[PDB]
Amino acid sequence: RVRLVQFQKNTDEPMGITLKMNELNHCIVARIMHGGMIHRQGTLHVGDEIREINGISVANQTVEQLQKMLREMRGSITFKIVPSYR
Amino acid sequence: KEYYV
């Protein structure tokens, strides 16, 4: 049910995904820009839920704080996710 | 609302 994934953010390029909070206050990958960083690395897919970012719980963060945290982060990044299924 | 990262 829970998966650990990793990706590399070594430039100033955006991740190229959009996030939304749903009714359970869960952080959901809503759209993925084709050709963008996440799309190329295959790290996340639409409907996946992000639980943690580098071991940092998403639950006690606002959407702005998450956006700022992700924009500024660099290097090897680990997500704990709840994957969606086709 | 949606948020870009």
Half-sphere exposure of A68 (CA within 13 A, CB side): 5
| CB of A31 less than 8 A from some CB of B | yes
CATH number of A1-86: 2.30.42.10
Taking CB atoms and an 8 Å cutoff, what residues of chain B touch A36? none
Q: Are B3 and A20 in contact (CB under 8 A)?
A: yes
Q: Are A4 and A83 in contact (CB under 8 A)?
A: no
Taking CB atoms and an 8 Å cutoff, what residues of chain A touch B4? 14, 17-18, 67
Taking CB atoms and an 8 Å cutoff, what residues of chain B touch A15? 5
Domain edges within chain A: 1-86
| CB of A47 less than 8 A from some CB of B | no
Q: Is A61 exposed, middle or buried (0-12, 13-18, 19+ CB in 10 A)?
A: middle
Answer whether A66 sits within 8 Å of B4, measured CB to CB. Answer: no
CA pair distance A84, A80, nearest whole angstrom: 13
Question: Could you tell me how far CA A57 lies from the centroid of its own chain?
Answer: 12
Q: Pairing mode, if any, of strands A75-82 and A49-53?
A: antiparallel
